[PDB]
Amino acid sequence: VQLVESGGGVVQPGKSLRLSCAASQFSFNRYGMHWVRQAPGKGLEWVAAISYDGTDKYHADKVWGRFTISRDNSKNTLYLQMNSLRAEDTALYYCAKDLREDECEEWWSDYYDFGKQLPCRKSRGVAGIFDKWGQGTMVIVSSASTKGPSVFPLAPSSGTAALGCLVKDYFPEPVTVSWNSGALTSGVHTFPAVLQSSGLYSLSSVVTVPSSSLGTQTYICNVNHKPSNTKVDKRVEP
Amino acid sequence: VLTQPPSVSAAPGQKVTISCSGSSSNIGNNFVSWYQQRPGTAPSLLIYETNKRPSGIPDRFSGSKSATSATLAITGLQTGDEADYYCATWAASLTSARVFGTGTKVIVSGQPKANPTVTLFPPSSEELQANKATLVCLISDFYPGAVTVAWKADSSPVKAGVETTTPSKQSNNKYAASSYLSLTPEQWKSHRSYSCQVTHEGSTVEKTVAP
């Protein structure tokens, strides 16, 4: 069994996009199919499901009327129409296969008469078991573009003590930080940035120095954001 | 809403226990599916129909079920078992309830643990005048690198405004992560204090600040 997703990319919040999943190496027309997203780095979340015949459609409430699953058994392709996107929809979308081989038991014998064809009353239905997965396709929804970092001071806490400066709301990486014009590499710890809900980046760099030198030695946070051509030299005071 | 333990860890050999939980509506009446997801790779079916394991999966991975819970178990742990473990349920057919568990990270490491040194900072005077607020809780030097930050305001817990980065190895092979509680100035002046609870290997460390 082999699943391959495609169609993902970067699209602004509101605009649409269409994800495809090319099925192969199995009888597509027999098994149900699901979509499962996973925001990096958080838990799994099933989006939508569809049965073998396409008579059954399932969706999560957070995607109730903005996402619709669909398939084309002739092309063994699974389609997910993503329109009216949100930032919270940002995730890696996995194409999943249902384990249970579905089969119909009761036919109506009322209409049409082929007249193709007759839908099923009591099919086995999806089992909800995601046995085979793809590597997924990434979907990025962000109302963000190039913006400069708003630098801010930090407090003296007690290593003994510990100072820093906050790099706030910038995009995109990289952002390099140094101290006292690269004279002070030492007792330095630059933490990794963040992935805000609004898609903006922000990091922090703490520094642990002699508490005795505070009143005397002055420490100046050197920030740098080359993409926005912004440099900042923030002087941190107690 | 099926909930699982944030983190789990054990040295190579001893047995591990992971449990789900929820109403009898999404536990008792239904079956339990389990899935493994090693780092940087797609998930995989571990156990379906509560007990039955598909081919390729060792007999170590034992499933289970009860009235309002469902437990996964791994006997002998290899470096490969180190992965994320989610549970799932699907019936009958469904409601507005969830589908997958919150997650449970299994870390396989016999090496000695290192407690986290939590460092909390209050917002700046400059920022408050910029009409915004930000609490920075910096977590450094810990191992096996499994944390679970939790913010609280005057005992009461906080939910919205939280953003927590993933742990990351330092130079000394110890992990470090940061958590920001973005806030409005009006919310910041409403409560006496704001706390930062870091939950690493059972033991919790709580720092707190005030204006």
Using DSSP's 3-state secondary structure scheme, residue A226 falls into: helix
Say which CATH topology domain B112-211 has. Immunoglobulin-like (2.60.40)
B162: nearest Cα among B178, B154, B151: B151
B89 phi, psi to nearest 5 deg: -145, 150
Which letter does DSSP use for residue B95 in this model?
-
d(CA A238, CA A188): 18
> Which positions in chain A touch B119 (Cβ < 8 Å)?
157, 162, 206
Spatial distance between the Cα atoms of B101 and B71, rounded to a whole number of angstroms:
12
Backbone phi, psi, residue A211, to 5°: -65, -20
* Distance of alpha carbon A121 from alpha carbon A125, whole angstroms: 10
d(C-alpha B86, C-alpha B139), whole Å? 26
Other Cβ atoms closer than 10 A to A5: 22
Beta pairing class for A2-6 and A57-59: unpaired
Do A1-143 and A144-233 come out as alike in CATH topology?
yes
What are the two backbone dihedrals, phi and then psi, of residue A62, each rounded to the nearest 5 degrees? -75, -10
**Alpha-carbon distance A194 to A215, whole Å?**
32
* CATH code of domain A144-233: 2.60.40.10
Identify all chain A residues contacting B121, using CB atoms and an 8 Å cutoff: 154-155, 157, 164, 166
Residue pair B19/B101 in contact (Cβ under 8 Å)? The answer is no
Contacts of A53 (CB under 8 A, 6+ apart): A102, A104, A119, A120, A123
* Method in brief: X-ray
The answer, yes or no, to whether the previous bond of B85 is cis (omega within 30 of 0) is no
Q: How far apart are CA A114 and CA A107, in angstroms?
A: 13
What is the separation of C-alpha A8 from the centre of its chain, rounded to a whole number of angstroms?
11
- Helices (H) and strands (E) counted in chain A, each on its own, are 0, 18
3-state secondary structure of A199: coil
For domain B1-111, give the fold. Immunoglobulin-like (2.60.40)
Q: What Å distances lie between residue B12 and B17, B78, B203, CA to CA?
A: 14, 6, 22
Spatial separation of the C-alpha atoms in residues A16 and A34, rounded to whole Å: 20
Q: What are the structural domain ranges in chain A?
A: 1-143, 144-233
CB atoms A192 and B168 under 8 Å: yes
Q: Which one, of A237, A162, A213, lies nearest residue B118 by Cα?
A: A162
Question: By CA distance, what is A49's nearest residue in B?
Answer: B90
Same fold, B1-111 and B112-211: yes
| Amino acid at position B100, single letter | F
Instruction: Select from 2.60.40.10, 1.10.287.110, 3.40.50.720, 2.40.128.120 the CATH code of A1-143.
Output: 2.60.40.10
- The values of phi and psi at residue A88, to 5°, are -70, -15
Distance, CA of A21 to CA of A135 (rounded, Å): 11
Domain map of chain B by residue range? 1-111, 112-211
Count the Cβ atoms, other than its own, within 10 Å of residue A104.
15
Residue B148 CA to residue A160 CA, distance in Å, equals 26
CA dihedral B75, B79, B80, B86 (to 10 degrees): 60
Residue found under tokens 């099933």: A46
Residue of A nearest to B132 (CA): A168
What's the order of all strands across the beta sheet hosting B156-157? B156-157, B149-153, B194-199, B204-209
Where is B127: in which H helix or E strand?
Answer: helix B125-129
3-class secondary structure, A187: coil
Contacts 24+ apart (CB under 8 A), B61-66: B61/B34, B63/B32, B63/B34, B65/B27, B65/B31, B65/B32, B66/B27
Chain-chain contact of B101 with A134 (C-beta, under 8 angstroms): no
How far is the C-alpha of A48 from the C-alpha of A7, rounded, in Å?
A: 17
